[PDB]
Amino acid sequence: KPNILIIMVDQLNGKLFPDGPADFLHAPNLKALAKRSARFHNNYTSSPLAAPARASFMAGQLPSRTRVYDNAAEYQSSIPTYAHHLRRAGYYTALSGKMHLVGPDQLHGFEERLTTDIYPADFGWTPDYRKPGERIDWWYHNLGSVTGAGVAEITNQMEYDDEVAFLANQKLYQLSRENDDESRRPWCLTVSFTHPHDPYVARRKFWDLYEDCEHLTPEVGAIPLDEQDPHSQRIMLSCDYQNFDVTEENVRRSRRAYFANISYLDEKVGELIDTLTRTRMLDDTLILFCSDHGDMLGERGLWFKMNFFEGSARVPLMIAGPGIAPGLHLTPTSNLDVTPTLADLAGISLEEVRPWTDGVSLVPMVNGVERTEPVLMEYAAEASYAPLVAIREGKWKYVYCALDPEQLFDLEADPLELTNLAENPRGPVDQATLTAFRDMRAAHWDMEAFDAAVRESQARRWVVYEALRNGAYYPWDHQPLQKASERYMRNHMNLDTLEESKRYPRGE
Amino acid sequence: KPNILIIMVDQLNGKLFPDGPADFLHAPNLKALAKRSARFHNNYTSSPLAAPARASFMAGQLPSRTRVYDNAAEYQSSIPTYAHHLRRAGYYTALSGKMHLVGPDQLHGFEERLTTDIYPADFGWTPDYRKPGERIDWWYHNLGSVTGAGVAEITNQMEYDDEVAFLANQKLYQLSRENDDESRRPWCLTVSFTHPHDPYVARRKFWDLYEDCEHLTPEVGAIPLDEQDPHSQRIMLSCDYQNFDVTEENVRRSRRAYFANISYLDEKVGELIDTLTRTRMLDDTLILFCSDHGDMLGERGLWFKMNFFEGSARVPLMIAGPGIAPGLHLTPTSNLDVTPTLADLAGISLEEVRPWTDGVSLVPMVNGVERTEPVLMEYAAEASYAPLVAIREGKWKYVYCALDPEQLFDLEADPLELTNLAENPRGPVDQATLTAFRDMRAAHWDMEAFDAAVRESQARRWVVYEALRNGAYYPWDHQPLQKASERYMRNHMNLDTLEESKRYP
Amino acid sequence: KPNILIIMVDQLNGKLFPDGPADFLHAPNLKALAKRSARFHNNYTSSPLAAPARASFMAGQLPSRTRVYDNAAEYQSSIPTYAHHLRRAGYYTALSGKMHLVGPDQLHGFEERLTTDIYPADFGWTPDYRKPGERIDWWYHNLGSVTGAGVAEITNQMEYDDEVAFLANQKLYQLSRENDDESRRPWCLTVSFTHPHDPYVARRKFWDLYEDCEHLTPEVGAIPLDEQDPHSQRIMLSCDYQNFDVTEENVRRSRRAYFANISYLDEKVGELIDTLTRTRMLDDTLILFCSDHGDMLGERGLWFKMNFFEGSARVPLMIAGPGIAPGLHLTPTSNLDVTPTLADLAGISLEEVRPWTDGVSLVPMVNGVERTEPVLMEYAAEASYAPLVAIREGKWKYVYCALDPEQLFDLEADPLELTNLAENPRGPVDQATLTAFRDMRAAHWDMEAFDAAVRESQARRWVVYEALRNGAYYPWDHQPLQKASERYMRNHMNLDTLEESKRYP
Amino acid sequence: KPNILIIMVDQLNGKLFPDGPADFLHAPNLKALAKRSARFHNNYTSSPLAAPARASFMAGQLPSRTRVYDNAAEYQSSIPTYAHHLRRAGYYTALSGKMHLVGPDQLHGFEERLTTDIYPADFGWTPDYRKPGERIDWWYHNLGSVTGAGVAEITNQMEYDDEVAFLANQKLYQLSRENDDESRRPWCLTVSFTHPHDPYVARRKFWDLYEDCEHLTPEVGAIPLDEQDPHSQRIMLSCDYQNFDVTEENVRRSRRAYFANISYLDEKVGELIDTLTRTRMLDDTLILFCSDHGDMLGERGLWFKMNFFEGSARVPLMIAGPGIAPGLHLTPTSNLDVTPTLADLAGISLEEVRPWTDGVSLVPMVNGVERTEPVLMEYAAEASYAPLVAIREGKWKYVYCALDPEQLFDLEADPLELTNLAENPRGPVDQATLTAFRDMRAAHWDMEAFDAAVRESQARRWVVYEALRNGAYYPWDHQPLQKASERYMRNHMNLDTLEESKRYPRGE
């Protein structure tokens, strides 16, 4: 069984990985990793928001099945994740960094978690479909990220990611000490960074890399509120866009700091791979690179995620290591496919994972078997007033919301999604394609039931959360375990025996 | 708003509370409490097993709605409980003792929990409908409790309940120090004991009280396996009955220690009442006495719970205090009614709890209003191979399982449930009644959907639990909060100011 | 090896134990214990203040040797205590309650400590010989305890002692589960209550016992400030006496509540004895009753301790159990003798404890052997401006401070210490006696070296403590160990095996 | 008040810093630091063993005064340290890394401690003068460090120091967030590394730096046991030297890994200085570089410390920052002088520190005032059977032990200490110098009282420690504080307010 290193980042627009990292990015370590990787060019999040995407990523199940509809929805402990599947199959599993799990279980199958979460574990960020049009200023996104972009040497997120990286490398060194033990468990380490999620604020060393950057304005500029589709209008209102004057210079500084933060992350990828190389674990390790959702980065005038346009819904996905053919894949894939792919790579049978996953293993794709299943997406959090669903199949993207006109995009002819073919069909094939996706949408979702489930989940939480914020608060944040009395040299040990056990490689 | 003291005990057969405690029980404090209480004589659990009964009790929802089907089913943190409803209404809420919550949330709305649980918080005790007939010896009930009954001065349970009682009285004293602050929150303290749950082992002082006891033998004796109904057979097999020779003296020793442990609990009830009296909180405090399920106590040859017969499904319920007229009520009620009753007594509107509770407030009954809503029960754990449901309405009890012959009992004519009127109707009224209950059951439950939901829950947990028991174990047991650097006299305080604040009256 | 139960109380005037508890005290359990005890009637503290007395008590060394001169002096972890000596000899050792250890070590050899301390563990209460005459209002004794005496159902101290008692009895029950394992360690449990230390506030049930009490007034009344000896004057000033109008009824209420809190403690003594009896450990258990210092209780107009007069310096001491002949002993003894007495009773050789203890075993006295070693006492805390030492030998008490007139009392002729024979000798024998005590004092103490050592200790702590109270505070208070994932039933265990191991007998 | 960064390392032979780091060392960051520093060439430990040196360093008091005679002697909480003095004067004080404090107080005035200790906090390593000639194999030094030298990518010590460095830099970044607050406290951060203490085992990257090294054998080779002075013989026996065949190749590999570990440390010095530079704190920060004791590194056949020869007793000392003239100082100085120097640099009056320190401030030396006080040293731990004391004054070193012949060395004429002038006086001046040091030794120490105090301390601890190791053990190791429920974003906070507070510099 190979080891598995999952490197996850937050809010990375997948269009920036057209074949590994785009040429204009300063990302030597991810570009070298890409050359060894199977690269999934048209890979999609299952839900364009952090906690829904991550609960879905961990379980290989859509939000409608995990019930994690938004950033404050409880993730049940009894739902199997890839950590459970691998752990059941004999793996040591650990997590360093972010997973935005909501509720008192902060492990969800991981055997060890090295850091707390950057974001809350409670029900505070619960949307309310009963009050459509409201926004909550103390936690909603707003365009102050765009007007406040710039340069700093420490931020909340850089403190977080510096520690995620350090503790992940330390864990790799600790794991190497078992390398000569025949009975060692294989390990699976998830390293989950919060960058390049906003605030768009970068260390000067990486900001300086992009002085001459030619990609600091999006190709598709800002669409006026009156000319926007209804969901994009709800997003603009939820970002408080009327109270911010976003200048061309703000757009450029935001994109520049965001690319700088990709370079910041690239340096950390290089450290992890260096640790794997020096500890002699690299040849036996699969490395997966992934992200939870994208960032519109100013395209169409939109920032952040919460929608199904390419910039928000596309995320990179790369896999390298023993048995993976390097190459670029164009067939659309999904984050839903990661858990069954990890299971397959770990030698777990198809039947063991079948009842628990909605995705498919990508290993047959890597080995030249055509993948035909569509890619599905869902959204049911802030800036929605009712659930949205999307189907990505072939060259098409279809988006449905009971409250909105449908959207249909031909991404081969119209990759910037500038022409809505459900509104303006080019001909008879477009009308037939629309009818096919409507039948497909009825085959996969009951949208009235979906809306009812989301409403009940929100209503429960608002009752419970109001109570939990009265009186003494009981926090659910993960606290990494304390072990000082068993670490380093203690006087129930023999010093020479301890030193030999902690040294690796030995006798060289 | 009144204070609320909830005294809960585990595995207390409600037939032993015919009008408060039975005369033969040595329970002077519970009898004095019962004399000033509204007493609900025909009160039922929602599910005859610890965790399902308690999750249902806390939420006022049936197991099919809470999804807590068995003793290892996760209770979701987002489900509102009476703790949430009261806390939201401005109560300080606390738990001392047992609640058998499964999963990483060990508070479920309680603001403070003073003890860990006596039982596990993880998925270990998950049944498996895919292996009907199996038993898990290391945690199933077995008849060894009956053959091992007797006397001891300490047990696992007595250690637990001694501490539960101590910390509850300590908390009451602590709360009394706020009794002169007009800004004080009203409090709701749940004190949840593990007795008289088995092992049937009692301290000598309480065992000696039942030497001449006339109730050491059940009136309905053991029914041989071949004459038992199918569910009773499944229970006997689950208890490993074939590997135990249960003598008459075994039966007598078990009941004697069980009664003795009721007397053990009665002394602790008196301690709490005493604390309320001397702190001068008694007149402003509602007191509820309740249990999660009963114990067959050898009746029909069965022990423990897991069934809908009276001894297992009946539990006492009493309410006393400000605005509570004392009296005996015979209309059937259930534990499902406690959470809406608590909300009503705390002044919460019916509309605030209507979407979250499926029982009804008993406060109208206390004030003379006739109740007509039937009582529903569910069971889907060990010794079931498919879910069972029951309906209790008027004089009738109806029990359905897709795998078993139906049962119908007329509890006025047949209080010991010796004649199954579904099999042996007395005439056309019994047949019409059976048809009426079948139609009512079909309107309330799809038993095939219920069975699918339970199997899905079991299978899910078996994947997860096998993973969680590999590698380093992460426990979910509640650990009461460590406060030593802030307790008593510390040198950021003024000693005189501290002594005055801690003195009451 | 016998078990050892040490019952310690705080601030108990030893004159109230003339032969066990005084007849007028309602203390049936302590009187029954005293009837089977060796009782040491003329027993003295080593230092009339909490932390110095207790550090001296634990080590069997005087404050000049432990360096614990006052209530804020660090007790070094390397100093052997009776806990170390017994633990080294194979005992499990535990503490429930108070010991007023100062510094980051809150165990000092105890293997387990069941409660935090009621008092601070840091250097806050450090006196300063550089500012003679100052008082620190936020922690000094003051006469407000006398004017504030009365009745309450909870206090800071009653919360503390209720918990001390509960956890001690719980621990005894836990220890009984090992009583049938031949490989068991013998145990030594120290149960250390804060009562009858002030505030003089009692529960109504115990206060009502002293309604017709004839001992509510001390026989020796208040001595006016100008007629007081210099040290007594320093105590009255330290207590802020000028700002309190202490009436006769104040005096009576304080003594009444103090006696009532002795009765409060007596009920807890009976609880412990009951636990030992029902667990069948009583016959194999030594029981020691002791106190750290006394309380003047208004005698001479003084309250509390900090002096060498009988009411402040006398503390009871009793020993009962296997191999202990009951009887009354009048030869002076001291708390310094407890640690070598415990070691001797546990079978530890005299040579193993000789280098670490400066008292003597009382076991020879119990067996009829005359004791001749004198009793020494020291004091160097608040209301002293330089150290004081005392010698107690035969009928005599001698008290020296470089700043004050000497005191010499003949306690046979003058048990209330009303005639200072150093100032008013009766004849040449008194003068020769004074000279003999002066020579003995000079051989035992260099008072100038003692004073330099105390000032150095105070000054050191004042530099350190001012730093430690800047920025984030790091508390040294003991936090009892969190064990919830290993207590009661957990799913790495077999339930039947667990129930059997936790049941005893 | 300037900030103060104290960089401490363990077991660094001071002869390797002849004027900053020796030319042959690969240490660019320490060499650049040295060019800005006042450098104390003839600086001495106060006691050649870890815990005695460190308790003495913290208090500015000799072991005879601190009572910390050996590696298991309790350090009383009531003894003032430089952390107390600075904290009382308004400083935030923190420690990352090792201080080998014995006893339940693991802070000794530090307001925060970021790591546990690498070594035990209990009484286990207590020598026993009642059994002269015994050794305790499970914790005594032995020459297996020399025969086991080599190359590894992780060791006990590298795991420790990697975390010391990471958490120290993180603390600097956190402290920078207060930089614009007028009411900020100044900070004093001690960063205390365990390298280059043995095992002599280094990462390959740094080992490779010394392939051509010309210093891999000591100038003074191994002295046979019969030809050794009595204390050196006791050290050889305590190291179990008879059971090890130390080859020339072992000597070279040990020295090579030790120099590699200096280079490992030099990289961490560079990171700390980079953090100070980017956070804009460097110009207001004093940087002190120091060590607890040396390492003989094979010289005379000896390894490790425990003696007063130059290699064991000399340690580097450098100070750089506002108001310090750079330059090299030859007058002998002591680690005892650090606490009163820090006090002086922080503006604390001489009188405030006078009753609590045995050393003198070095600031007047830096400013051209001649220092005349001698340097004193003491040793009373393993391989001593009675206390040893030493005086270093002018060109002389004098060593006294009641059980041994005296030693007298003229370090100007005889810098390798090859001629004992107390045994072979060159003339009448040598005999007069010996008599002067004897009178000086009687003026500073009562050696019989010293021996009695050490004996009583050992005897107490053996009683107590035997008891503490019966039954359940209560550990004293420092456990760094848990704060997950107050870290990063929690839902009692406003997200925008949090991000602004955690970003620094702001608005750039």
Ligand SMILES: C[N+](C)(C)CCO
């Ligand atoms: C990331 N935000 C918290 C700003 C909004 C997502 O719920």
Ligand SMILES: C[N+](C)(C)CCO
């Ligand atoms: C460093 N050693 C532990 C090996 C010896 C010093 O006491």
Ligand SMILES: [Mg+2]
């Ligand atoms: Mg995200």
Ligand SMILES: [Mg+2]
């Ligand atoms: Mg139960």
Ligand SMILES: [Mg+2]
């Ligand atoms: Mg006291």
Ligand SMILES: [Mg+2]
């Ligand atoms: Mg060292």
